[PDB]
């Protein structure tokens, strides 16, 4: 339609106003003294959340240019959540700081593309320095502390994540689920996990988490590809009568003749989903057989000659809970048979003892790790649904933070790591003066997380920032106890991946936004 076109400082201040609205709503949640945000939901009760990305996703403005800025900066929280699942508030705070300082430099007549280049150079240097001063979470062994910090100083959540990592392994699969009591529970049970996603965007359930849940579902397995509808239509009727939702693990499924027909068949009463099969050839068949044995099902094949028309409900597999996400799909609890599971584990161990191929060896080691470790389910204890959603979000944040910590390491929390890397980059220079000003903009924005943490505590951010900058190493400000000390010793640890990702995404988006002179939107 007809477009409103704005130029220069008018467009820039409107975009900054939108960025500020989103970033203020998100930044009120930063740190231990960060507060909560109520998001009105079109379905049911409002959501109370301390998660930056949840607040960011819900922000949309009446003013179109302000909304444009809000959406562009909301991309920062979205990317931070997608990458690290944590630090979305920090990423938003950093993006707002870079935007504000860069727009100030633009108003000083400097070339915004050179400012963007300086910001990018500073952020590359800072990512290198973050890697340099990162400390492995195996050496530090503070997975509980990382989980506690990421769960808003909830020591019980961090202890639970630490116990789950001690039980199913630091790389084992852990899933956060809604509990039934008022207490958080940890249950290590038998399950399977494969890194595959749903093949239909309309499969998403009523919750907007992006992943679908199947309660006591029906597992279907097939290594070959079927053509005719009427061949497996009686199987569709049998599934429709089993009472348990259908999850199909096949090589690949379209939506032209299967998803469209079923979506025109239902109004949404039963959630039927299909997933891809990791690997190919012999590996796909062997993983399918393992999944069938875990769930008590069977896998059809051309060589076997078994047809789906003769398949019964008892022949097919059954589970208790399945979580299907784009990144990773996990069958949480498949009944199957414990003796069968143990026998399959022993058989795969014997196969390891037999085979010698390097790729086969590593895939068999992955298989035995998946089977022996099982899954660990953390049931969130909460008296109400709003408390359940809040605590589950915090536990998922702690889970993501602990995974990122054991993957990439830890650094001093409370914004201290960014302060230290900015201090180490004081002598960084660019090609020209505008690049140097962009570098200074990035370095000053690197203090914004600590300053916002301190602002949320009601203290004076400049004094605390100066005291931290005057220190060295992991010296910083415990905002919970409102006192200075060694951040590592006090247990305030941030995953290096979370900090690095927040900085990188904030920098990319914000540096792009400071280079804008014109904005085109609808009237």
Judged by CB under 8 A, the chain residues 15 through 44 that form the site for a second copy are 15, 21, 24-25, 28-29, 32-40, 44
Q: Are 188 and 374 in contact (CB under 8 A)?
A: yes
Which residues are CB-neighbours of 205 under 8 A, at least 6 positions away? 212, 213, 271
Tokens of 73: 């900066």
Tokens of 458: 């009601």
**What residues between 450 and 489 interact with ligand ATP by CB under 6 A?**
453, 478-480
Residue 147 CA to residue 155 CA, distance in Å, equals 8
Tokens of 149: 């910090």
Q: Are 283 and 256 in contact (CB under 8 A)?
A: no
DSSP 282-330: HHHHHHHHHHHHHHT--EE-TTT---GGG--TTTSEEEEEEEE-SS-EE
Query: Shortest Cβ distance from residue 132 to ligand ATP (Å)?
Result: 19
Listed ranges 134-142, 161-169, 236-244, 366-374: which one lies at the site for a second copy (CB under 8 A): 236-244
**Paired strand residues for 410:** 135, 495
Interface pick for a second copy out of 182, 346, 355, 369 (rule CB under 8 A): 182
Interface pick for K ion out of 20, 29, 47, 150 (rule CB under 5 A): 29
Q: 49 or 67: whose CB is closer to ligand ATP?
A: 49
Q: 344 or 500: whose CB is closer to a second copy?
A: 500
Q: What angle do CA 273, 252, 318 make, to 5 degrees?
A: 45
Tell me: is residue 364 an annotated ligand-binding position.
no
Site string for ligand ATP, 39-58 (x = CB under 6 A): -----------xxxx-----
Query: Shortest Cβ distance from residue 291 to K ion (Å)?
Result: 37
Residue 415 touches which of K ion, ligand ATP, Mg ion, none (Cβ within 5-8 Å per kind): ligand ATP
Residue 380 CA to residue 231 CA, distance in Å, equals 43
89 touches K ion (CB under 5 A): yes
Residue 494 touches which of ligand ATP, K ion, a second copy, none (Cβ within 5-8 Å per kind): ligand ATP
Total residues at interface with a second copy (CB under 8 A)? 121
* Three-class SS state of 60: coil
Tell me: is residue 265 an annotated ligand-binding position.
no
293 touches a second copy (CB under 8 A): no
471 touches K ion (CB under 5 A): no
414 touches K ion (CB under 5 A): no
522 touches a second copy (CB under 8 A): yes
133 touches ligand ATP (CB under 6 A): no
Interface pick for ligand ATP out of 494, 495, 496, 505 (rule CB under 6 A): 494
Q: 150 or 200: whose CB is closer to K ion?
A: 150
- In 45-172 the beta strands, taken as DSSP E runs, fall at 47-49
How does DSSP classify residue 202?
A: G
398 touches ligand ATP (CB under 6 A): no
Tell me: is residue 373 an annotated ligand-binding position.
no
Tell me the angle at which helices 64-83 and 88-107 cross, rounded to the nearest 10 degrees: 140
Beta strands 410-412; 475-478: pairing state: unpaired
Would residue 184 be called left, alpha or beta, if left means φ above 0 and alpha means ψ between -120 and 50 degrees?
Answer: beta
**What residues between 316 and 375 interact with a second copy by CB under 8 A?**
none
Residue 223 CA to residue 237 CA, distance in Å, equals 21
First to last CA, the chain: 8
Query: Shortest Cβ distance from residue 52 to K ion (Å)?
Result: 5
Of 482, 455, 485, which is closest to residue 473 (Cα–Cα)? 485
18 touches K ion (CB under 5 A): no
336 touches K ion (CB under 5 A): no
Site string for Mg ion, 85-114 (x = CB under 5 A): -x----------------------------
Tell me: is residue 333 an annotated ligand-binding position.
no
Cα dihedral 486, 465, 473, 162 sign: positive
Tokens of 502: 């927040």
Q: 285 or 394: whose CB is closer to Mg ion?
A: 394
Tell me the angle at which helices 433-445 and 88-107 cross, rounded to the nearest 10 degrees: 150
By CB under 5 A, name the binding residues for Mg ion: 86, 150, 397
Residues placed in the known binding site for ATP: 29-32, 50, 86-90, 414, 478-480, 494
> Which residues are part of a known binding site?
29-32, 50, 86-90, 414, 478-480, 494
What does the binding site for ligand ATP look like in residue numbers (CB under 6 A)?
29-32, 34, 50-53, 86-90, 149, 153, 397, 413-415, 449, 453, 478-480, 492, 494
């Amino acid at each position: 339609a007809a477009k409103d076109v704005k130029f220069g400082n008018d467009a820039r201040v409107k975009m900054l106003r939108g960025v500020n609205v989103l970033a203020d709503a998100v930044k009120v949640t930063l740190g231990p003294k960060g507060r909560n945000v109520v998001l009105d939901k079109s379905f049911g009760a409002p959501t109370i959340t301390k998660d930056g990305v949840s607040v960011a996703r819900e922000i949309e403005l009446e003013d179109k240019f302000e909304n444009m800025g809000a959406q562009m900066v909301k991309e920062v929280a979205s990317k931070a959540n997608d990458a690290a699942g944590d630090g979305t508030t920090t990423a938003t705070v950093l993006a707002q700081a870079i935007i504000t300082e860069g727009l100030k430099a633009v108003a000083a007549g400097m070339n915004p593309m050179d400012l963007k280049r300086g910001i990018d150079k500073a952020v590359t240097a800072a990512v290198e320095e973050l890697k340099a001063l990162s400390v492995p979470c195996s050496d530090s062994k503070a997975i509980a502390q990382v989980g506690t910090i990421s769960a808003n100083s909830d020591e019980t959540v961090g202890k639970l994540i630490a116990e789950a990592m001690d039980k199913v392994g630091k790389e084992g699969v852990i899933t956060v689920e809604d509990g039934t009591g008022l207490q958080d529970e940890l249950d290590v049970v038998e399950g399977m996990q494969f890194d595959r996603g749903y093949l239909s965007p309309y499969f998403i359930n009523k919750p907007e988490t992006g992943a679908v849940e199947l309660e006591s579902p029906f597992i279907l397995l097939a290594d070959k590809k079927i053509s005719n509808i009427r061949e497996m239509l009686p199987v569709l009727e049998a599934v429709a009568k089993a009472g348990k939702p259908l999850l199909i693990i096949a090589e690949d499924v379209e939506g032209e003749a299967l998803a469209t027909l079923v979506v025109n068949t239902m109004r949404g009463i039963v959630k039927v989903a299909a997933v891809k099969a990791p690997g190919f050839g012999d590996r796909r068949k062997a993983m399918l057989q393992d999944i069938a044995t875990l769930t008590g099902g069977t896998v059809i094949s051309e060589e076997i000659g078994m047809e789906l028309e003769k398949a019964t409900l008892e022949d097919l597999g059954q589970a208790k809970r399945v979580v299907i996400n784009k990144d990773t799909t996990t069958i949480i609890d498949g009944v199957g048979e414990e003796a069968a599971i143990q026998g399959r584990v022993a058989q795969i161990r014997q196969q390891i003892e037999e085979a010698t191929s390097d790729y086969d060896r590593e895939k068999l080691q992955e298989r035995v790790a998946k089977l022996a470790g099982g899954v660990a389910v953390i049931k969130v204890g909460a008296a109400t649904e709003v408390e359940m959603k809040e605590k589950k979000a915090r536990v998922e944040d702690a889970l993501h933070a602990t995974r990122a910590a054991v993957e990439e390491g830890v650094v001093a929390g409370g914004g201290v790591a960014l302060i230290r890397v900015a201090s180490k980059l004081a002598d960084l220079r660019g090609q020209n003066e505008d690049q140097n000003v962009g570098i200074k903009v990035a370095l000053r924005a690197m203090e914004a997380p600590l300053r916002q943490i301190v602002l949320n505590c009601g203290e004076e951010p400049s004094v605390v920032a100066n005291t931290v900058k005057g220190g060295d190493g992991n010296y910083g400000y415990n905002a919970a106890t409102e006192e200075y000390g060694n951040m590592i010793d006090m247990g305030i640890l941030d995953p290096t991946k979370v900090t690095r990702s927040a900085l990188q995404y904030a920098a990319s988006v914000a540096g792009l936004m400071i280079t804008t002179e014109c904005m085109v939107t609808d009237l």
